[PDB]
Amino acid sequence: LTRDGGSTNSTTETFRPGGGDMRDNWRSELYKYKVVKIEPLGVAPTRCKRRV
Amino acid sequence: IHLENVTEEFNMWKNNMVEQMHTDIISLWDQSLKPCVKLTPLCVTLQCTNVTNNMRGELKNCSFNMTTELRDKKQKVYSLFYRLDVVQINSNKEYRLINCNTSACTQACPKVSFEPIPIHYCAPAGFAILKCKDKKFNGTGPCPSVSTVQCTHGIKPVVSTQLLLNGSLAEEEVMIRSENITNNAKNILVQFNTPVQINCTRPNNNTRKSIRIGPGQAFYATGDIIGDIRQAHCNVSKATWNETLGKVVK
Amino acid sequence: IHLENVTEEFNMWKNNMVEQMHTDIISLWDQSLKPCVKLTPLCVTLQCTNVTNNMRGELKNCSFNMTTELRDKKQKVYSLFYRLDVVQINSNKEYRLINCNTSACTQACPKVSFEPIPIHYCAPAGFAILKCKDKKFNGTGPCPSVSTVQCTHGIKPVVSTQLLLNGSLAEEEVMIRSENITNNAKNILVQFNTPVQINCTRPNNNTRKSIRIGPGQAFYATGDIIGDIRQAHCNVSKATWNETLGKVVKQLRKHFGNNTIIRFANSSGGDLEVTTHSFNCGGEFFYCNTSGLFNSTWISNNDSITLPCRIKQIINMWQRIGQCMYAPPIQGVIRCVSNITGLILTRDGGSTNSTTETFRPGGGDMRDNWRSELYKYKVVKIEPLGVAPTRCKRRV
Amino acid sequence: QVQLIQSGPQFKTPGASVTVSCKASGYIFTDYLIHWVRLVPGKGLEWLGRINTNAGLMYLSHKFEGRLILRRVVDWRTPSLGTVNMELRNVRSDDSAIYFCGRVVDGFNAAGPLEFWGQGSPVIVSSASTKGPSVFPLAPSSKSTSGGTAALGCLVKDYFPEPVTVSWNSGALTSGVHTFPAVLQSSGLYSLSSVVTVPSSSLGTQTYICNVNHKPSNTKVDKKVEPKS
Amino acid sequence: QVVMTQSPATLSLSPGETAAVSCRASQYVDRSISWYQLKTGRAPRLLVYAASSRSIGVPDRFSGSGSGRDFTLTIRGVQSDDFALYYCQQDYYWPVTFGQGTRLDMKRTVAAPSVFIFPPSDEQLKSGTASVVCLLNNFYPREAKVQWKVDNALQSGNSQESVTEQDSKDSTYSLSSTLTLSKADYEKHKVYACEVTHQGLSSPVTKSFNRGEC
Amino acid sequence: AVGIGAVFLGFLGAAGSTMGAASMTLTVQARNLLSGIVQQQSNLLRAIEAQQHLLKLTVWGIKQLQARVLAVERYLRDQQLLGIWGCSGKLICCTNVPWNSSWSNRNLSEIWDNMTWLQWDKEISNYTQIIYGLLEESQNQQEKNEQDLLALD
Amino acid sequence: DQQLLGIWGCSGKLICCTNVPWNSSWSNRNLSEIWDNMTWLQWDKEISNYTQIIYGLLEESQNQQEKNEQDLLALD
Ligand SMILES: *[C@@H]1O[C@H](CO)[C@@H](O[C@@H]2O[C@H](CO)[C@@H](O[C@@H]3O[C@H](CO[C@H]4O[C@H](CO)[C@@H](O)[C@H](O)[C@@H]4O)[C@@H](O)[C@H](O[C@H]4O[C@H](CO)[C@@H](O)[C@H](O)[C@@H]4O[C@H]4O[C@H](CO)[C@@H](O)[C@H](O)[C@@H]4O)[C@@H]3O)[C@H](O)[C@H]2NC(C)=O)[C@H](O)[C@H]1NC(C)=O
Ligand SMILES: *[C@@H]1O[C@H](CO)[C@@H](O[C@@H]2O[C@H](CO)[C@@H](O[C@@H]3O[C@H](CO)[C@@H](O)[C@H](O)[C@@H]3O)[C@H](O)[C@H]2NC(C)=O)[C@H](O)[C@H]1NC(C)=O
Ligand SMILES: *[C@@H]1O[C@H](CO)[C@@H](O[C@@H]2O[C@H](CO)[C@@H](O[C@@H]3O[C@H](CO)[C@@H](O)[C@H](O)[C@@H]3O)[C@H](O)[C@H]2NC(C)=O)[C@H](O)[C@H]1NC(C)=O
Ligand SMILES: *[C@@H]1O[C@H](CO)[C@@H](O[C@@H]2O[C@H](CO)[C@@H](O[C@@H]3O[C@H](CO)[C@@H](O)[C@H](O)[C@@H]3O)[C@H](O)[C@H]2NC(C)=O)[C@H](O)[C@H]1NC(C)=O
Ligand SMILES: *[C@@H]1O[C@H](CO)[C@@H](O[C@@H]2O[C@H](CO)[C@@H](O[C@@H]3O[C@H](CO)[C@@H](O)[C@H](O)[C@@H]3O)[C@H](O)[C@H]2NC(C)=O)[C@H](O)[C@H]1NC(C)=O
Ligand SMILES: *[C@@H]1O[C@H](CO)[C@@H](O[C@@H]2O[C@H](CO)[C@@H](O[C@@H]3O[C@H](CO)[C@@H](O)[C@H](O)[C@@H]3O)[C@H](O)[C@H]2NC(C)=O)[C@H](O)[C@H]1NC(C)=O
Ligand SMILES: *[C@@H]1O[C@H](CO)[C@@H](O[C@@H]2O[C@H](CO)[C@@H](O[C@@H]3O[C@H](CO)[C@@H](O)[C@H](O)[C@@H]3O)[C@H](O)[C@H]2NC(C)=O)[C@H](O)[C@H]1NC(C)=O
Ligand SMILES: *[C@@H]1O[C@H](CO)[C@@H](O[C@@H]2O[C@H](CO)[C@@H](O[C@@H]3O[C@H](CO)[C@@H](O)[C@H](O)[C@@H]3O)[C@H](O)[C@H]2NC(C)=O)[C@H](O)[C@H]1NC(C)=O
Ligand SMILES: *[C@@H]1O[C@H](CO)[C@@H](O[C@@H]2O[C@H](CO)[C@@H](O[C@@H]3O[C@H](CO)[C@@H](O)[C@H](O)[C@@H]3O)[C@H](O)[C@H]2NC(C)=O)[C@H](O)[C@H]1NC(C)=O
Ligand SMILES: *[C@@H]1O[C@H](CO)[C@@H](O[C@@H]2O[C@H](CO)[C@@H](O[C@@H]3O[C@H](CO)[C@@H](O)[C@H](O)[C@@H]3O)[C@H](O)[C@H]2NC(C)=O)[C@H](O)[C@H]1NC(C)=O
Ligand SMILES: *[C@@H]1O[C@H](CO)[C@@H](O[C@@H]2O[C@H](CO)[C@@H](O[C@@H]3O[C@H](CO)[C@@H](O)[C@H](O)[C@@H]3O)[C@H](O)[C@H]2NC(C)=O)[C@H](O)[C@H]1NC(C)=O
Ligand SMILES: *[C@@H]1O[C@H](CO)[C@@H](O[C@@H]2O[C@H](CO)[C@@H](O[C@@H]3O[C@H](CO)[C@@H](O)[C@H](O)[C@@H]3O)[C@H](O)[C@H]2NC(C)=O)[C@H](O)[C@H]1NC(C)=O
Ligand SMILES: *[C@@H]1O[C@H](CO)[C@@H](O[C@@H]2O[C@H](CO)[C@@H](O[C@@H]3O[C@H](CO)[C@@H](O)[C@H](O)[C@@H]3O)[C@H](O)[C@H]2NC(C)=O)[C@H](O)[C@H]1NC(C)=O
Ligand SMILES: *[C@@H]1O[C@H](CO)[C@@H](O[C@@H]2O[C@H](CO)[C@@H](O[C@@H]3O[C@H](CO)[C@@H](O)[C@H](O)[C@@H]3O)[C@H](O)[C@H]2NC(C)=O)[C@H](O)[C@H]1NC(C)=O
Ligand SMILES: *[C@@H]1O[C@H](CO)[C@@H](O)[C@H](O)[C@H]1NC(C)=O
Ligand SMILES: *[C@@H]1O[C@H](CO)[C@@H](O)[C@H](O)[C@H]1NC(C)=O
Ligand SMILES: *[C@@H]1O[C@H](CO)[C@@H](O)[C@H](O)[C@H]1NC(C)=O
Ligand SMILES: *[C@@H]1O[C@H](CO)[C@@H](O)[C@H](O)[C@H]1NC(C)=O
């Protein structure tokens, strides 16, 4: 759907069948996925020491 | 695997993988056409008249000259075209194809089907896909329950304009979502709680004919329509459609 | 490196690398044609008549209209073709090229030689090739002596139908191999103890002529023949052929029950490329009818055979329907002097109560030419990790 | 699954060359000998030859040598698929038969037990051309010949090719009807001595119309009958 | 070439009886006989592919057997679709050869033919040709013949004969016979007859006319 | 599904558990960080197989091959960076850099017993480029001190 | 391989002794005949039943050993 401004008065909601680039057909199916890069290294403090 | 106690921000508008899908589909489309015959010799002057055996004025019947396989020999030949495929270049009226001033065209190979198979998108090593599991998610915010997965749903690459079909549908309620709603230049995507089922038909008993353009190259002409010529059209139930709008309005 | 003390099971029929070799040769062949001129303007109506100055009805003399470099100008011109290159499209008779209803053709570039160089196939890192060393190994089973090698022998990619030539020879005795022998749909491959040597020739003194099709594109017409015209043919020493078949028969008797009447016959029926021995010599493609060689019978007890040939300018390799190519006529007179290494046989069912041993020169896909040379190789993956018990422990 | 598909039926003129194709599917097509077997109608089967679908060689019954050629089409890709073509050259009218494509039993590539068969292609050979039947009444055989059964018919005669279609009273009469199977006569045309038998109470008073049609010409005819002298 | 003999020419059996069809070769062939069932309008079907080796997918009522020169297809409990043609086939020597085949016929009691004749149609005579037609109707067993007579002297080679499929209702058959002449040859004679021969008849039933009457 | 200790037998399943309990599962991310390439090398395939001509769709496989070289190389860089701190053999190291509690004031209990690793990341990501500098230098001198000891003996 | 050989606590070495006891159900064969009679190609064909058990035991044996060492350094 695509919307329009206040059509005369009271309604702000004349809706019309929209469109655009086909790209948002993919955004319909990919609506819930995300991608992330793992960062496996960590550094954190505790009470242990190495010896030489 | 459910990532226990996890909660993080999804945003489907700024999402990268939609743009990879768009770019992949365009590239896969082009290479499905690249091995097929370039139809250039069809960009030639046509003599035409309206079709006979019918309301419609949409079909024109057109005759033209075309090369045989032998370079020095050419034939009179004829085919049916839609009023949208042809332009009056002009006694009888005289035409060309619509594209013929701006580009050549490729004929799509008959052995290759346009039907959309399921496709899965998979993460390369040292990356993970996350999936927001929450059935009330609107496409922008902190999702309070998530899974990782190695690879997506079987997404199917349909293409359509005003409404979208054979795709997946949410279980909780009709979902409506937008990058802002209040700004008119943004779309609203609506996803239904249940399908509504469309039947579509092309009632002409259509006949293909083959023309050799050259040595091993052939063009598939519209040859003839047997029986009555009748309009292509689609049906949907007035009752369940009216009910479905009754839900999106709420 | 000879692997001390080893013994493991080889199988040449289920061997993957013959399929890689087959698939690679096709790809290398295509790229060797890829830049060369597409001959589409030659698919045009030809006036023709027979050649004059000569038995041979095989040469057609043909005239047609061809483009120049200038789009608005075209020229009447003429060339010779073999009767196998043309179809009567139709007063004098009138013709087209054979391909001209099914594909364009690429003319093979004159600068590229067809001649088969030695090729070595090499193991990628973390894999090893094995080679079976046992000189009495047939195509399957536990080879009792093996070496690793990083890369193969210099295998040369010859292409031939009914018999195979310039290939490798078994040292011990005539060898025969099959995926089962008894099941007639399988080939019997035969490999010789010693080669037998063939001379081939095309005695017509060819003059090539250049036609310019277009702005920078040239087509190499058969221009003229100088002197008399005479048949292309091949020769082999009858005594050494008769000796060689005497040795192959003495092997086949071991499988086929001693006192059975083994006999040879020609490649019965179908088209030219199943019925003939076909090979390239220096840029001409020969097709020769081997019935002079395969016509004999064998009870359990100084001169040349000649066999004639026919020639084509267009060829269509590996039965790839869309892929015509046109070979330009090579200048002067040619001959080849080559070692027949071995031959491909096909069996027939029990002809009578007495015999099950009519044999005919076989064929199929070119792929078992590679299976002749790759018969002793195998490829394996190193698994370098191992775990085993002993009596040592780590401490903390 | 194993499946052989042949070409549809054909009509050919004497001295022509006839081609029957056979598509082969569902098994490694190179690994079984295909055979050709001919069913001449009323007579026993006859064997033409066999083809080694790998090597492409053919072997023929001696009687058919020179006059017959078998060919094989295949690709090294898609080995589960292939084709065989039979060309019988220089046909006679007595080559009129069904030609069957067939395949041997598994592991039995040295003999003739055929497990899988194509649907059989009829090849009928005549100089004739498309012609509807003449309809002649076999007007009911009289009480001075037939006794208590009124035998009647229609000699639907001299047509080509098959089929005719025949009924009595446009199919309202079926009791005692016999559309005798057609003979392809010495003329090169079919004939069909059709009959119906009914009680001699009703020699011509009850209705008897033979209803006749011939789909190759699309010719259609009908004829009423009553008793002879 | 190897000659195959079958016997009988036809075997007549009731549903649930047992069948034995013989085949024999002109010289030794080593167990290498196939048997085919042929049902009309369909490809032959392989029952047995060497002596006693039943085909896969064939019901066990069929069993082959044989020596090196003679062979026997056997069926236990003959069923409603077992009524068909059966051929033995030999392939020990090329070319492959087949017997004349044996018909399997549904046994039923003896029934004599009813018999009729027709002169040529008046329109047929006017068209310049003359077919004289004879009908033999619903007899059993199948064995029937017409003898055609002109001036009621017996004649040959001037006729064709057609026979029905086996009647599924009652096992009977019918035969339609047709003598044919040019109208001149028809009118050069004055008497016509069809004489009927059948397995059960008292004497050959003969139906007759003088030319122009039935 | 949801809770501490339960999903640790799957990749990342620990991510909402607290840092102490998550410290048992470290081998699972470490293995799946590289060997997930099984889902590439099992199924990457070229001409003749599935495809014939359309040749840019064989050369499309550069996307999949480029992902593989990034994966092995980004992994290999961790083994370098963990190596120069004098620590390559191990999933855990004690080291002789003292914790400057300016980097976080939070006590030893609450970091191990309350926070998740995704929460701790957002503190120390301010200071980590200090801490990596200190770790490198602490090892660089230790290598020399050991060489002098093995010499002066 | 270098990853898998690493997580057993064995990364620097061609040979390791390790704290997993050999369950002779994996092979009943005595210490002489395994080292003195068999080739490595013969041994593979036995232990290829149990290898995925032995790798699991090696992993867990190391994974707790790292923690026991961290405590032995923490009790300073
Ligand atoms: C290498 O290549 C060979 C040749 O192709 C191949 O050998 C062939 O093996 C098949 C296996 O099926 C043999 O086929 C027949 O098998 C049946 C078994 O029948 C029972 O089981 C089947 C299961 O499907 C059921 O259908 C059936 O109802 C039964 O329950 C046998 O009955 C056949 O008997 C014939 O062969 C016997 C010898 O094995 C003979 O004693 C007998 O007479 C039969 O006829 C043969 O002898 C005739 C007279 O000499 C001769 O003229 C005939 O042509 C025929 O040879 C039969 O065994 C098949 O026989 C084998 N082929 C040949 C030519 O013998 C190997 O399997 C293959 N090996 C590998 C590893 O690939
Ligand atoms: C589209 O235009 C084409 C070309 O003008 C039309 O095709 C031609 O149609 C005529 C009849 O209007 C055909 O002639 C008839 O052919 C039959 C052949 O058996 C003959 O019996 C008739 O006496 C008559 O000659 C003609 O064959 C046909 N083709 C050509 C090349 O002229 C066509 O009718 C138009 N409409 C459609 C739906 O195609
Ligand atoms: C197919 O090709 C043919 C042959 O090129 C075309 O037919 C020809 O078309 C031209 C142009 O319309 C005709 O020219 C006219 O001729 C008359 C009489 O000479 C003259 O008065 C006009 O001024 C004009 O010059 C020509 O007659 C016609 N026929 C021939 C035999 O040349 C045809 O147009 C092409 N297209 C189709 C759909 O057939
Ligand atoms: C999709 O759903 C999420 C919740 O799951 C919606 O989040 C809401 O986003 C708006 C801004 O888009 C937030 O409004 C802001 O709130 C602060 C309150 O301190 C105020 O100062 C700002 O002026 C502004 O109003 C809102 O707090 C946030 N949460 C909720 C519960 O509404 C999101 O808007 C939804 N998107 C669509 C397009 O429906
Ligand atoms: C889409 O909806 C339309 C309207 O409901 C459907 O059209 C109707 O289809 C039936 C079956 O084809 C037509 O009945 C037939 O009509 C002809 C002409 O009167 C008659 O000869 C037949 O015996 C039969 O009664 C019906 O007339 C037609 N109704 C209208 C108003 O056009 C259509 O079938 C639906 N489905 C699809 C897939 O489009
Ligand atoms: C193949 O066909 C071509 C074309 O018909 C033949 O070529 C032409 O042959 C004639 C003689 O048969 C040539 O004419 C003579 O040329 C000489 C040149 O010195 C001249 O002295 C004579 O007075 C006479 O003009 C003609 O030039 C030649 N070329 C063409 C384009 O016509 C050819 O002979 C046939 N046979 C072969 C083997 O090529
Ligand atoms: C090479 O190109 C030339 C020119 O296009 C071709 O020559 C021409 O061929 C045609 C067709 O055979 C000749 O037409 C005939 O003309 C006579 C007299 O007018 C007429 O009675 C016939 O019905 C027919 O139309 C034409 O005369 C001839 N020459 C010219 C100048 O047009 C030639 O066929 C092409 N091929 C070769 C191998 O030369
Ligand atoms: C190449 O040489 C090897 C020997 O080096 C041949 O191996 C033979 O393979 C056949 C099966 O193809 C074996 O027959 C089977 O033997 C077992 C014995 O337990 C028996 O139970 C089976 O019924 C069957 O007879 C055979 O024993 C074996 N050895 C020999 C010496 O033949 C291999 O077949 C040769 N390749 C070719 C194409 O002949
Ligand atoms: C292949 O084998 C044939 C037969 O052994 C060889 O044919 C022989 O070739 C020579 C040289 O061309 C011929 O000599 C010449 O014969 C002609 C006609 O008699 C004469 O005018 C010459 O003065 C000269 O003597 C020889 O007659 C011929 N032999 C026979 C019996 O035909 C051929 O050379 C072999 N070579 C190749 C490359 O295949
Ligand atoms: C395989 O070998 C056989 C026997 O050597 C070849 O059979 C022969 O084929 C030729 C074809 O040229 C037949 O020649 C002709 O004879 C008849 C008259 O009988 C004539 O009408 C034809 O015009 C032609 O000149 C020949 O009869 C036949 N048999 C013999 C004894 O030669 C067969 O062609 C060979 N196949 C191949 C591909 O090598
Ligand atoms: C099988 O092997 C033979 C023997 O090598 C191949 O025949 C020919 O071998 C000779 C010597 O290697 C080639 O000679 C060279 O020719 C070039 C070009 O003329 C020249 O520059 C060199 O000085 C040398 O004389 C000869 O070209 C070649 N013959 C041909 C026509 O190819 C044979 O090609 C091999 N393959 C087959 C299928 O027989
Ligand atoms: C290569 O193939 C040909 C067939 O294409 C083989 O058969 C030979 O074909 C020729 C021509 O048809 C036969 O010619 C004979 O001519 C005399 C003339 O008097 C005639 O009486 C004979 O009946 C026959 O037609 C020739 O006899 C025939 N060959 C044999 C062995 O009989 C040819 O044999 C093949 N080439 C070689 C070297 O074998
Ligand atoms: C293929 O094998 C057959 C036998 O299976 C060969 O049979 C006969 O062999 C002779 C000598 O090669 C042929 O030549 C003629 O022999 C007569 C003998 O009286 C002689 O008078 C003639 O002057 C001539 O030398 C004979 O035609 C041939 N007969 C038959 C029926 O084939 C045959 O020659 C072999 N063919 C080849 C090309 O190997
Ligand atoms: C979701 O994550 C939270 C932490 O972010 C988990 O909450 C609770 O975490 C504490 C440690 O911070 C756990 O306390 C310990 O529990 C054991 C067994 O009860 C006890 O022996 C120790 O002395 C200490 O109290 C606590 O178990 C844990 N759960 C609860 C219910 O408090 C939470 O476990 C995660 N969600 C789920 C459903 O597991
Ligand atoms: C139908 O045919 C007439 C006469 O040829 C033409 O004027 C009219 O424009 C045609 N209709 C359409 C919609 O093309
Ligand atoms: C169906 O349409 C009518 C008119 O638009 C409307 O009154 C009715 O409420 C709709 N049905 C539902 C269930 O809303
Ligand atoms: C040779 O030329 C003549 C006359 O042009 C022709 O009749 C004959 O058919 C030609 N030869 C062949 C083999 O066609
Ligand atoms: C040469 O051929 C003849 C006839 O086939 C045969 O008698 C002779 O034994 C052959 N030579 C040898 C060495 O076998």
Residue numbers in the entry:
A (entry chain G): 454 to 505
B (entry chain G): 84 to 137, 150 to 185, 187 to 309, 312 to 321, 321A, 322 to 347
C (entry chain C): 84 to 137, 150 to 185, 187 to 309, 312 to 321, 321A, 322 to 398, 411 to 505
D (entry chain E): 1 to 52, 52A, 53 to 71, 71A, 71B, 71C, 71D, 71E, ...
E (entry chain F): 1 to 214
F (entry chain I): 512 to 664
G (entry chain D): 589 to 664
Paper text:
Recognition of N-linked glycan at residue N276 (glycan276) at the periphery of the CD4-binding site (CD4bs) on the HIV-envelope trimer is a formidable challenge for many CD4bs-directed antibodies. Cryo-electron microscopy (cryo-EM) structures of these two antibodies and 179NC75, a previously identified glycan276-dependent CD4bs antibody, in complex with HIV-envelope trimer reveal substantially different modes of glycan276 recognition.
The most potent VRC40-lineage antibody VRC40.01 neutralized 81% of viruses on the 208-pseudovirus panel with a geometric mean IC50 of 0.073 μg/mL. Modeling of the VRC40.01 Fab in the cryo-EM density was facilitated by a 2.83-Å crystal structure of VRC40.01 Fab. VRC40.01 bound an epitope overlapping the CD4bs and used both heavy and light chains to interact with glycan276. Overall, VRC40.01 binding was dominated by its heavy chain, with CDR H2 making the largest contribution and both heavy and light chains making extensive interactions with glycan276. The role of this FR-H3 insertion in binding was confirmed by mutating VRC40.01 Fab to remove this insertion; when compared with the wild-type VRC40.01 Fab, the deletion mutant showed reduced binding to BG505 SOSIP.664. Also, the germline revertant of VRC40.01 did not bind BG505 Env trimer, whereas the mature antibody bound the trimer at an apparent KD of 60.2 ± 5.1 nM. These characteristics indicated that VRC40.01 belonged to the VH-gene restricted category, unique in the known glycan276-dependent antibodies.
